[PDB]
């Protein structure tokens, strides 16, 4: 079926899934049970951005289902697909909100799930200064764990934040990637709906930094499209639900690139089969220009490795501290004393260690 009916199918599936879990919350916890996300002043960001209304109980969460229904208009026109994509996003938030209601601890390690408001504030400044050039939203499954780790480690090397959702989390673990908020690689969850918490990062950035008010959907979608440098990288087979999420990402102005054959849309939905080119395509697709310094060193160099916790067992050499004498200094001298690029390692080297 064509791209439109594929999006409408996945959006209707997302509505059906949200209708099922919402009923479970009504039957188990009642319509008065409080619904809320861990540490957030915007209740359910997506619903608060679209309607400007805050959802506080299961009964109000039930009413939010009508927002998903209203956004799905099965007419073949671009504005209708994008609205259908947002219906998938609202449904994903409803499902994720009900997950926290029906479970004391819905997320298991290494998954993070909902991202707290202070973390959004923490990443806001580095996004503005360009320290975080982009946010790579990787979803799906790669042919092997070697390709998944090469792509993550490359994005992390560029300092782009990398958010993983699906089997790519298991593949990255096997391929030895260093995950963590400071390491700029955050695993959200295995379910497709877990991608909504990154969407909330972009929406909350418009409310927090952009200073946009709730209900101003057109203004929030403009902020994410022009200011939040995000893009999606969907690997492995794509289900109808995943394609609807892709339409939701496109609605926020984020291009979606996939290794699977799909009906392409220039500068929006693209298809790259070569994994060794994926990173370069994604950056070009979202106008992310990386200022490469090109230092001649055998190890990586990026802002993600800041505040590294090199502990005793994982360490080989130690200098300074209440252990040995260490110092640093910068001097001003004439052109005669300085011989431009000159590296002289007086004393023993790390090879001498045993």
């Amino acid at each position: 079926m064509n791209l439109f009916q594929t999006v409408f199918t996945g959006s209707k599936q997302a509505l059906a899934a949200a209708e099922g879990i919402v009923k479970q919350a009504v039957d188990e916890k009642g319509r008065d049970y409080k619904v809320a996300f861990p540490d957030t002043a915007y209740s359910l960001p997506v619903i608060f951005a679209a309607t400007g209304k805050k959802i506080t109980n299961v009964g109000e969460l039930e009413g939010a289902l009508d927002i998903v229904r209203s956004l799905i208009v099965e007419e073949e026109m671009l504005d209708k697909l994008l609205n259908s994509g947002l219906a998938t996003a609202v449904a994903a938030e409803i499902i994720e909100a009900a997950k926290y209601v029906l479970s004391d601890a819905p997320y298991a390690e290494p998954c993070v799930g909902f991202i707290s408001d202070p973390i959004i504030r923490s990443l806001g400044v580095p996004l503005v200064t360009g320290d975080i050039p982009g946010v790579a939203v990787i979803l799906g499954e790669c042919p092997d764990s070697e390709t998944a780790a090469k792509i993550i480690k490359d994005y992390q090397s560029k300092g782009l934040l990398t958010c993983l959702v699906g089997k790519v989390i298991d593949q990255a673990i096997e391929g030895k990637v260093k995950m963590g908020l400071d390491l700029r690689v955050i695993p959200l969850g295995y379910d497709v709906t877990s991608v909504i918490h990154v969407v909330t990062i972009a929406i909350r950035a418009a409310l927090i930094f952009g200073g946009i008010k709730g209900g101003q959907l057109n203004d929030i979608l403009k902020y994410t499209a022009e200011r939040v440098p995000a893009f999606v990288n969907a690997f492995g087979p794509l289900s109808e639900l995943v394609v609807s999420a892709g339409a939701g990402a496109i609605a926020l102005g984020f291009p979606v690139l996939t290794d699977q054959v799909v009906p392409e849309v220039p500068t929006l939905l693209l298809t790259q089969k070569d994994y060794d080119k994926m990173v370069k395509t994604s950056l070009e697709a979202r106008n992310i220009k990386i200022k490469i310094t090109e230092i001649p060193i055998p190890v990586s160099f990026a802002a993600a490795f800041e505040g590294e916790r090199i502990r005793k067992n994982d360490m080989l050499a130690e200098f300074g501290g209440n252990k040995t004498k260490a110092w640093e200094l910068v001097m001003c001298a004439d052109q005669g004393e300085v011989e431009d690029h000159k590296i002289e390692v007086i004393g023993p080297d790390i090879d001498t260690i045993d």
């Binding site: 064509n2 791209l3 439109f4 671009l78 504005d79 009906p263 392409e264 849309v265 693209l270 298809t271």
Partner: protein, 630 residues
């Protein structure tokens, strides 16, 4: 009370001046014609010999059923239709034939030369002419010889463009409508329409289809391709449209007609230092060159020359009293201009021995010395500024900006901007094909056509274009239809937010183009066939499988009939704003608007209401999308 004459305020203003001046216009002569013969309007009147004239009944079962020879209404109507196609094909045939002869006389230190060498190298490949280590002029002459053969070769096979899908060629072959030499097919239709020859509606209509193909894929194509070789391939360029382009204190030289060689030489002549100084000697600021109809489109596309107006505006241009010289060549030149120019100082100069108009200054265009001949004609227009009556001059202060030069090469270049360097391929129509399959753009329509007093001037053109772009259908325009849009202001980048739908506005912003693309003159409709062909070939389908359509909201010329016919025979549905004379032939109506679909995958649609036409185009496109699975 009385129906409006036009939707353009500049046109309406000069029409009032024409009444005050006491001159007659095409709109006035339309009223004088009063009720038009129904027999002729239904196509049931035959004059193909001196046994008549015969006139059978358009309503079957009553009145006279057959002609003196025995021809039924369906036979009479089908032959009448055929002859219009054969006449339309002939107009474009001589046009391209002249261009090819010019290509055969190109030289490195000559008046006519090859400007686009790359295009010539590509065209030479299709005609099987070698290019490796050879003079560009030796290649140009061999190409011209191969191109000229397509007009009258009696043995062998004709050379067709590469953009034409093999599925479309095989369909024509099996249907028995594969094209032969250009002039040969015109003779074939004229022979079979003769008394006592063909008396079968289906066979006759198939003969017109075969003939019309020699226009679109041969006469027009070669006319367009060779014009781009000698005068340059068009590219995105800016210009002003409407009668407000004329300047009161400058010499106004209006070029009307269709032949591009004369207009290309009058442009170069306007840059001769002696002529620029002669204009000042007479008391003018400079030389203000303007165009009208095709010849104007062909110069605005390549050199950004300003457009004075379309078909029905040609008389009102003289009424401004500012046209010093009106140089005409051939086709769509109303003979009334000879009588009208007498009431003003305007000089009506005819140049082609093909179109001689009585009581007009005749200055033949010497093709041997083209630039010198062009300078002699332009000098006469400059000197005529001395007889301008500045007190009675009235140029409405109404002009509009426009962007054109959207050739297939240019459209591909602009589409490359939305291609990823690490993934997408380059210099292909893929971005357009991708947007159509995805559904962002519901389809692509081609609004072409003339001006007819049966329709409010430009009314159906604008209403049709507007409705299509609003429904996410990218619109391409040519001829008077393109000019109608240029005058209104649809050929602007800002027209996307103002009128385009959600998807088309997005594509317009990404590719950086207006929602309406001016592809050139009516001969340049071959570029539309070329574009639709590349999309079909790239997707591995026939042209009938794509969500594409053609529209002629206002049309008159027999060229529009041949155009419509080859567009439908090529697999593209066509909507007609003016009803052709087929009403009286029930079998012919069924063939044209129904059975034809079973033969070529496309059909004709007659709809005078433009609002109903856009509804039908969208519904039809969707039907073809659902069949294809897009």
């Amino acid at each position: 009370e009385e129906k409006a004459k036009s939707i353009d305020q500049a046109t309406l203003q000069l029409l009032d001046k024409a009444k005050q001046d006491g001159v007659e216009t095409v709109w006035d002569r339309k009223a004088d014609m009063k009720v038009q013969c129904g027999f002729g309007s239904a196509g049931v009147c035959c004059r193909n010999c001196s046994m008549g004239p015969c006139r059978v009944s358009p309503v079957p079962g009553k009145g006279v059923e057959r002609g003196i020879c025995g021809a039924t209404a369906d036979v009479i109507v089908s032959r009448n239709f055929a002859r219009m196609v054969a006449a339309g094909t002939a107009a474009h045939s001589d046009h391209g034939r002249s261009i090819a002869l010019s290509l055969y006389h190109t030289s490195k230190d000559g008046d006519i030369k090859v400007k686009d060498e790359n295009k010539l190298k590509e065209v030479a490949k299709s005609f099987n002419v070698e290019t490796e280590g050879r003079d560009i002029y030796d290649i140009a002459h061999d190409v011209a010889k191969e191109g000229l053969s397509n007009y009258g070769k009696q043995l062998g096979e004709v050379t067709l463009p590469p953009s034409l899908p093999e599925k479309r060629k095989e369909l024509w072959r099996k249907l028995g409508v594969y094209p032969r030499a250009v002039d040969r097919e015109i003779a074939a239709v004229m022979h079979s329409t003769h008394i006592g020859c063909n008396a079968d509606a289906e066979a006759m209509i198939k003969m017109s289809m075969r003939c019309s193909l020699t226009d679109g894929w041969m006469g027009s194509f070669m006319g367009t391709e060779f014009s781009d070789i000698m005068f340059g391939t068009p590219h995105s360029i800016d210009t002003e449209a409407n009668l407000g382009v004329l300047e009161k204190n400058s010499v106004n030289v209006v070029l009307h007609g269709h032949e591009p060689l004369l207009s290309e030489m009058v442009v170069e002549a306007a840059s001769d230092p002696e002529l620029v100084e002669l204009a000042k000697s007479v008391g003018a600021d400079g030389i203000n060159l303007c165009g009208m109809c095709c010849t104007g489109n062909e110069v605005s596309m390549r050199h950004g020359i300003k457009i004075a107006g379309n078909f029905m505006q040609q008389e009102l241009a003289v009424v401004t009293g500012a046209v010093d010289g009106l140089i005409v060549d051939v086709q769509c030149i109303m003979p009334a201009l000879a009588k009208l120019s007498k009431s003003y100082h305007t000089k009506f100069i005819t140049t082609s021995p093909k179109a001689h108009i009585t009581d007009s200054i005749y200055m033949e265009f010497d093709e041997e010395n083209p630039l010198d001949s062009a300078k002699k004609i332009l000098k006469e227009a400059i000197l005529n500024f001395k007889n301008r009556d500045q007190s009675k001059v009235m140029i409405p202060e109404l002009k509009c900006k426009a962007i054109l030069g959207y050739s297939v090469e240019e459209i591909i270049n602009k589409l490359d901007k939305v291609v990823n360097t690490q993934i997408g391929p380059m210099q292909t129509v893929k971005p357009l094909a991708d947007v159509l399959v995805s559904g962002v753009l519901r389809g692509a329509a081609a609004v072409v056509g003339c001006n007819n007093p049966k329709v409010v001037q430009d009314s159906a053109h604008i209403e049709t274009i507007k409705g299509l772009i609003k429904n996410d259908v990218i619109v391409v325009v040519t001829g008077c239809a393109a000019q109608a849009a240029a005058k209104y202001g649809l050929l602007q980048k800002e027209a996307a937010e103002k009128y385009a739908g959600p998807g088309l506005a997005t594509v317009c912003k990404l590719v950086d183009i207006p929602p309406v693309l001016h592809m050139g003159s009516c001969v340049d409709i071959s570029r539309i066939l070329d574009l639709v062909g590349r999309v079909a070939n790239l997707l591995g389908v026939d042209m009938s499988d794509l969500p594409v359509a053609g529209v002629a909201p206002e049309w008159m010329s027999e060229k529009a009939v041949a155009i419509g016919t080859y567009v439908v025979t090529s697999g593209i549905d066509t909507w007609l704003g003016v009803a052709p004379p087929v009403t009286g032939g029930p079998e012919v109506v069924d063939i044209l608007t129904n059975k034809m679909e079973d033969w070529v995958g496309a059909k004709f649609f007659i709809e005078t209401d433009p609002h109903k036409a856009v509804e039908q185009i969208v519904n039809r496109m969707n039907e073809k999308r659902k069949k294809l699975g897009i």
